[PDB]
């Protein structure tokens, strides 16, 4: 037998392939449950998305689905299945089925001490995933511990491409105090000053923040708002050099930085006295104020800290990069319909 499976007085219509549900959380803009995949005979995660009333959530839903169905990588979360109605008129929701991952690095960090071996392995897998992402001309733009999933053997997978964009360094520049929606604590300094976050260097900064967080179990730059985020960064990195200021042409941004009291660099080894010296060398090169001087993903992978794992032939790049920048919600619904048709019985 079957019906329209309910969860918490809530339509969670995923059968017949997915049975014995269990409510988890309120996700991003939908309920998330776990369920037993009767084909693969293992439990899975299913997210309910209801985006069709809003052009905005249509675009984010289509982009995420496009990106995750295009990408195929061990260190990036895959879409196993997409459940929706057989007709556009009847499609009100979409269910995205993914591997059930047992935890994530945010949860892990608040509960568990990480060994240096764990920090190394996690960092390796983050950058391995990121190399692929970046090779597809895509920026994640929201890397943080909660977007790094882990299973019980510490396999790590990057998730949540909600804010992801095709790279666009020619259109990165903007004015001072430009609004930006990614999570504060992992935003690069240039986002507050002169950058829309359209270059690969914004993701490396986030990885740097994540590394620091793995070393101490707490966020390195927990800014309480826009400019406090920046005062946090400069209290550790120290005031930017004249050279670095000269790369900021925008006068509001440059004059802001010049108005601040001088701050001296805090040595990494004093912030993290138990950390591996090679980890601190690599941390230093990712958390560089100047985005142009910031280490690249490939260089990070080649750094001595990761030498036990480094294997470029086993660090794949994307077959089919997103060549270009990727419209009413009615069109986006049809686009979502078309993009998800491959999962329909047939």
- The strand pairing partners of 148, in sequence order, are 158
**Calpha distance 223→74 (Å, rounded):** 33
Residue 197 has, within 13 A of its CA and on its CB side, a CA count of 27
DSSP state of 62: H
Residue 96 marked as a ligand binder: no
Residue 47 marked as a ligand binder: yes
**Calpha distance 197→206 (Å, rounded):** 11
Three-state SS across 43-59?
A: EEEEEEECCCCCHHHHH
| Phi/psi at 58 (5° precision) | -55, -55
Structure tokens at 310: 């480094």
**Calpha distance 221→67 (Å, rounded):** 29
Q: Which has the closest alpha carbon to 93: 338, 339, 336, 343?
A: 336
- Apex CA 148: angle with CA 143 and CA 151, to 5°? 175
**Calpha distance 142→264 (Å, rounded):** 29
Catalytic, out of 93, 99, 104, 142: 142
Residue 53 marked as a ligand binder: no
Structure tokens at 75: 């260190």
Structure tokens at 166: 């095709």
Kindly provide the residue ranges of all beta strands, DSSP E only, lying in 56-130, ordered along the sequence: 81-83, 94-99, 103-104
Structure tokens at 39: 């084909």
Helix 55-70 with 329-340: angle, nearest 10 deg: 30
Using the structure block, give the residue that is written with the tokens 């590394």.
211
Sign of the alpha-carbon torsion through 12, 16, 21, 24: negative
**Calpha distance 160→100 (Å, rounded):** 14
Query: Going by DSSP bridges, is the β-strand pair 81-83/32-37 parallel, antiparallel, or unpaired?
Result: unpaired
Experimental method: X-ray
**Calpha distance 91→87 (Å, rounded):** 6
Three-state SS across 228-276?
A: HHHHHHHHHHCCCCHHHHHCCCCHHHHHHHHHCCCCCCCCHHHHCCCCC
- The strand pairing partners of 90, in sequence order, are none
Cβ density class 154-173: b for 16+ within 10 Å, e for less: eebbbbbbbbbbbbeeeebe
CB 251 within 8 A of CB 235: no
Q: In which region does residue 148 sit, left (phi positive, over 0), alpha (psi from -120 to 50) or beta (all else)? A: beta
- The total number of residues written for the chain in this structure: 346
Residue 41 marked as a ligand binder: no
Structure tokens at 3: 């019906």
CB 132 within 8 A of CB 75: yes
**Calpha distance 239→186 (Å, rounded):** 19
Residue 126 marked as a ligand binder: no
- The strand pairing partners of 36, in sequence order, are 19, 43
CATH code at 304? 1.10.510.10
From the centroid of its chain, how far is CA 328?
Answer: 27
- Apex CA 313: angle with CA 308 and CA 319, to 5°? 135
**Calpha distance 166→160 (Å, rounded):** 15
**Calpha distance 311→329 (Å, rounded):** 44
- The strand pairing partners of 49, in sequence order, are 94
Helix 116-135 with 277-286: angle, nearest 10 deg: 30
All residues at 6 or more sequence positions from 204 whose CB lies less than 8 Å from its CB, including other chains: 130, 286, 294, 295, 296, 297, 300
Residue 132 marked as a ligand binder: no
Resolution of this model in Å is 1.8
Residue 162: domain span: 103-314
Structure tokens at 302: 């080649």
Q: Which has the closest alpha carbon to 82: 132, 26, 18?
A: 18
**Calpha distance 126→301 (Å, rounded):** 10
Distances (CA, A) of 321 to 67, 161, 171: 10, 15, 19
Q: Which has the closest alpha carbon to 174: 112, 248, 103?
A: 248
Q: Is 142 a catalytic residue?
A: yes
CB 312 within 8 A of CB 301: yes
């Amino acid at each position: 037998g079957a019906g329209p499976e309910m969860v918490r007085g809530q339509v969670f219509d995923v059968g017949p392939r997915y049975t014995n549900l269990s409510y988890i959380g309120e996700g991003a803009y939908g309920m998330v449950c776990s369920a037993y995949d009767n084909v693969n005979k293992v439990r899975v995660a299913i997210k309910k998305i209801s985006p069709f009333e809003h052009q905005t959530y249509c675009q984010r839903t289509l982009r995420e689905i496009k990106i995750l169905l295009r990408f195929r990588h061990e260190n990036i979360i895959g879409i196993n299945d997409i459940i929706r109605a057989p007709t556009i008129e009847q499609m009100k929701d979409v269910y995205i089925v993914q591997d059930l991952m047992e935890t994530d690095l945010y949860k892990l960090l608040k509960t568990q001490h990480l060994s240096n071996d764990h920090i190394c392995y996690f960092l390796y897998q983050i950058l391995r995933g990121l190399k692929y992402i970046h090779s597809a001309n895509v920026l994640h733009r929201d890397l943080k511990p909660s977007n790094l999933l882990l299973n019980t053997t510490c396999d790590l997978k990057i998730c949540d491409f909600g804010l992801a964009r095709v790279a666009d360094p020619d259109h990165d520049h903007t004015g001072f105090l430009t609004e930006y929606v990614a999570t504060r604590w992992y935003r690069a300094p240039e986002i507050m000053l002169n950058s829309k976050g359209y270059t690969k260097s914004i993701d490396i900064w986030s990885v740097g923040c994540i590394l620091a967080e793995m070393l101490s179990n707490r966020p390195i730059f927990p800014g309480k708002h826009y400019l406090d985020q920046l005062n946090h960064i400069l209290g550790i990195l120290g005031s930017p050099s004249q050279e670095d200021l000269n790369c900021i042409i925008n006068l509001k941004a440059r004059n802001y930085l010049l108005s601040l009291p001088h701050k001296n660099k805090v040595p990494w080894n004093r912030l993290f006295p138990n950390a591996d010296s090679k980890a601190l060398d690599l941390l230093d090169k990712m958390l560089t104020f100047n985005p142009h001087k910031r280490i690249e993903v490939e260089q990070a992978l080649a750094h001595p800290y990761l030498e036990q794992y480094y294997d470029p032939s086993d660090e794949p790049i994307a077959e089919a990069p997103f060549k270009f920048d990727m419209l009413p919600k009615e069109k986006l619904k049809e686009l979502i319909f078309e993009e998800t048709a491959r999962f329909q019985p047939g």
